[PDB]
Amino acid sequence: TIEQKTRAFTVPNIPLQTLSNSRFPSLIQGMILSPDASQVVQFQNGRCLIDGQLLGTTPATSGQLFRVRGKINQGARTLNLTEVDGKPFMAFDSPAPVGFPDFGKCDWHMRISKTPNNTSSGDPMRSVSVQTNVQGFVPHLGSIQFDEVFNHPTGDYIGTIEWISQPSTPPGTDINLWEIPDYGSSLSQAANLAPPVFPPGFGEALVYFVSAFPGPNNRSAPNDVPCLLPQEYITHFVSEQAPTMGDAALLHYVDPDTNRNLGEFKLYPGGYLTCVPNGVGAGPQQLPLNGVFLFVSWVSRFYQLKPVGTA
Amino acid sequence: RAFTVPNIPLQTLSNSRFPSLIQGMILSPDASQVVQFQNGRCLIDGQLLGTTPATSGQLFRVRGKINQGARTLNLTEVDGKPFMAFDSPAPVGFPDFGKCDWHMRISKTPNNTSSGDPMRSVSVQTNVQGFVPHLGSIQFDEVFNHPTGDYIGTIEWISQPSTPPGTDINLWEIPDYGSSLSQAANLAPPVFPPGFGEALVYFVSAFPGPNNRSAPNDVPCLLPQEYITHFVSEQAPTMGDAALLHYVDPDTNRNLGEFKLYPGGYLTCVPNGVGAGPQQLPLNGVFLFVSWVSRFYQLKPV
Ligand SMILES: CC(=O)N[C@H]1[C@H](Oc2ccc([N+](=O)[O-])cc2)O[C@H](CO)[C@@H](O[C@@H]2O[C@@H](C)[C@@H](O)[C@@H](O)[C@@H]2O)[C@@H]1O[C@@H]1O[C@H](CO)[C@H](O)[C@H](O)[C@H]1O[C@@H]1O[C@@H](C)[C@@H](O)[C@@H](O)[C@@H]1O
Numbered sequence: 001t002i003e004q005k006t007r008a009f010t011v012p013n014i015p016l017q018t019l020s021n022s023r024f025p026s027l028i029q030g031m032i033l034s035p036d037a038s039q040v041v042q043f044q045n046g047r048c049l050i051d052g053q054l055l056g057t058t059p060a061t062s063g064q065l066f067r068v069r070g071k072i073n074q075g076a077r078t079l080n081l082t083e084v085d086g087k088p089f090m091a092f093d094s095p096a097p098v099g100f101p102d103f104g105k106c107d108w109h110m111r112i113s114k115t116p117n118n119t120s121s122g123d124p125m126r127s128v129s130v131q132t133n134v135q136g137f138v139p140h141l142g143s144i145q146f147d148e149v150f151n152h153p154t155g156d157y158i159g160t161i162e163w164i165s166q167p168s169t170p171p172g173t174d175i176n177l178w179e180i181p182d183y184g185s186s187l188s189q190a191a192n193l194a195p196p197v198f199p200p201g202f203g204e205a206l207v208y209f210v211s212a213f214p215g216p217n218n219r220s221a222p223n224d225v226p227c228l229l230p231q232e233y234i235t236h237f238v239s240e241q242a243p244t245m246g247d248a249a250l251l252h253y254v255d256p257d258t259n260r261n262l263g264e265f266k267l268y269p270g271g272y273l274t275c276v277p278n279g280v281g282a283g284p285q286q287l288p289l290n291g292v293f294l295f296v297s298w299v300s301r302f303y304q305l306k307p308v309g310t311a
Numbered sequence: 312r313a314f315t316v317p318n319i320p321l322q323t324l325s326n327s328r329f330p331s332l333i334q335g336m337i338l339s340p341d342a343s344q345v346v347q348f349q350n351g352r353c354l355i356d357g358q359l360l361g362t363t364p365a366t367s368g369q370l371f372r373v374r375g376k377i378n379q380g381a382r383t384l385n386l387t388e389v390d391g392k393p394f395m396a397f398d399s400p401a402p403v404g405f406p407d408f409g410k411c412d413w414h415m416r417i418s419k420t421p422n423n424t425s426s427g428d429p430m431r432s433v434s435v436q437t438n439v440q441g442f443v444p445h446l447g448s449i450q451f452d453e454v455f456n457h458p459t460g461d462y463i464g465t466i467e468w469i470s471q472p473s474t475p476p477g478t479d480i481n482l483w484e485i486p487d488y489g490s491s492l493s494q495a496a497n498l499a500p501p502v503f504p505p506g507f508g509e510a511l512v513y514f515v516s517a518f519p520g521p522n523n524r525s526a527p528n529d530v531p532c533l534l535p536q537e538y539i540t541h542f543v544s545e546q547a548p549t550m551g552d553a554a555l556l557h558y559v560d561p562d563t564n565r566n567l568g569e570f571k572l573y574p575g576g577y578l579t580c581v582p583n584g585v586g587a588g589p590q591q592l593p594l595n596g597v598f599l600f601v602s603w604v605s606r607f608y609q610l611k612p613v
């Protein structure tokens with residue numbers, strides 16, 4: 001319809017501190033730049049074009065995000081993946097089932113239970129561990145491998161990663177949540193991976209939204225999980241499907257108390273934000289978390305942003 | 312601002328009492344069922360009620376301080392901000408699962424270590440003297456012999472209440488937020504069956520744990536969480552007694568049934584006799600706002 005092809009672009013009118021991470025369900029706790037200015041990312045969750053096209057394993061909503069489901073035989077180590085709703089995972093079509101975790105460079109410590117409940121007594125929760133850099137980690141091929149033999153009844157199991165730790169191998173290496181796992185095998189490449197996102201350069205830098213995930217690391221600091229977009233942005237775009245009318249959407253991060261612009265950002269159609277750091281050490285991490293991103297105008301990709309923060 | 316609801320199939324939307332996909336749309340098994348959920352409560356102009364969060368990020372989490380050797384979790388908001396006593400039933404997003412024991416998993420935050428499993432199991436009964444979230448605290452079943460600090464987590468699975476012994480889980484109910492001395496202030500109000508041929512519509516998702524029926528623990532809620540987020544963002548003024556919705560098959564554009572969305576944040580339909588109701592409909596439909604109507608507008612039976 002005319003209305004559909006002329007639908008004005010909008011973003012959710014909610015403060016950032018109230019919005020959610022798109023790599024796991026949690027409130028956003030900060031904005032950061034990547035420690036390495038050359039950091040390329042290839043997250044498989046939290047990937048959506050601003051006209052509402054989902055990429056990688058990204059779900060439309062948080063209901064499906066960061067869950068794992070599959071069948072496992074008693075005495076086996078192999079979880080044969082399905083979609084979160086129990087339907088078959090069409091392998092080679094996607095890197096993994098929709099919402100499957102994309103936490104690379106760490107060990108996963110999962111909690112799962114047999115579904116649906118068919119019991120009248122007892123604790124149904126089971127602890128399993130998954131390494132992501134071993135030959136058995138092949139979600140693209142339809143399966144992942146637990147560390148230990150699964151001595152519990154054969155069936156359909158659902159759950160999630162509860163906490164993460166430093167990868168078992170190579171021994172001594174740290175968690176690196178900037179990376180995704182290898183979804184494929186030594187024999188087969190993972191098909192339909194969401195593409196990499198490169199630093200824009202020319203004064204601009206990628207903006208990441210972070211939330212702490214349980215577990216230790218070599219730095220005795222929170223495991224901050226960076227993502228490109230709040231989940232509510234993704235849901236909004238999927239619902240709205242507003243046509244992209246320019247190279248980038250200029251956003252102002254506005255203080256709700258004073259109505260003053262705290263920082264200029266560009267939201268690119270590929271589904272990521274940039275800013276111009278106001279010198280070394282400056283950046284969006286210096287801004288309060290109660291601001292609201294407001295859509296100002298479609299702009300050229302060459303449009304220059306006022307630098308944000310203080311060096 | 313014109314009123315709209317999210318253009319996303321129902322099966323892709325989320326429960327507003329815990330983060331999970333909606334797996335069904337039902338009427339209450341008891342036609343006289345009154346509900347008083349504290350989460351998933353939002354006026355359709357974007358006004359949150361009870362303990363309802365704007366988004367799923369805050370939903371169904373518990374945070375507080377606990378001392379090594381104590382049984383008491385002194386609650387904060389999920390972001391660590393102080394919780395004000397006597398003001399609300401509980402912190403924003405605090406679970407509202409009544410008539411069950413809670414089996415929680417929590418961890419000390421932020422991480423300040425390079426070693427170890429940080430996860431702790433604790434259990435909470437909701438009908439005991441120590442369950443007083445309105446006063447800012449809940450009591451664990453066992454003494455907490457783990458380091459003092461700021462803990463965050465959620466309910467992992469539920470079971471039949473410890474007392475009275477033998478009683479079953481009933482997720483149509485909420486816990487007792489209040490104390491012996493005072494009732495909880497600012498509870499979201501009860502929602503009563505509308506009568507006049509109409510019936511309340513509930514969105515259901517399964518939650519882990521046993522029960523006396525050896526069946527799934529089904530969690531009913533009044534609105535998908537995405538509807539709440541939408542209303543909070545849009546803040547569209549209510550301009551009729553009810554918003555008339557069509558539940559549309561997006562594959563064909565066929566109208567599968569008429570519903571009313573009331574200003575108080577709940578949906579009704581008219582069942583076409585017994586056996587009929589929204590549970591007969593496929594879950595891939597999208598609700599579409601059609602018109603503001605008066606409360607006397609008669610719905611076509613579903
Ligand atoms: C405190 C506890 O663990 N209670 C268990 C109970 O434990 C014992 C029974 C007898 C002895 N003994 O001879 O000395 C020692 C320990 O065992 C029964 C039977 O297995 C458990 O009840 C059953 O499982 C529950 C999950 C419910 O489905 C219940 O209906 C079943 O009968 C009992 O577990 C507790 O049951 C309570 C209701 O009666 C209530 O549901 C409570 O939350 C349950 O405790 C939880 O589950 C336990 C298995 C355990 O994990 C505990 O830490 C949890 O809090």
Ligand SMILES: CC(=O)N[C@H]1[C@H](Oc2ccc([N+](=O)[O-])cc2)O[C@H](CO)[C@@H](O[C@@H]2O[C@@H](C)[C@@H](O)[C@@H](O)[C@@H]2O)[C@@H]1O[C@@H]1O[C@H](CO)[C@H](O)[C@H](O)[C@H]1O[C@@H]1O[C@@H](C)[C@@H](O)[C@@H](O)[C@@H]1O
Pocket residue numbers: 107109129165166167168171172216217425426427428
């Ligand atoms: C298999 C295991 O449990 N590995 C543990 C290791 O356990 C033992 C140490 C010594 C004995 N013994 O003398 O007989 C027996 C078992 O203990 C070390 C600490 O000394 C653990 O490493 C530390 O904790 C981890 C969570 C990491 O933070 C790590 O950096 C710390 O040094 C070790 O845990 C495993 O470490 C691996 C990296 O080296 C990897 O992170 C792996 O996932 C860890 O295993 C998990 O955590 C354990 C504590 C345990 O809960 C296990 O079930 C988990 O899979």
Ligand code: NA
Pocket residue numbers: 132133134135136137138139182183184185186
């Ligand atoms: Na692999």
Ligand code: NA
Pocket residue numbers: 437438439440441442443444487488489490
């Ligand atoms: Na109480």
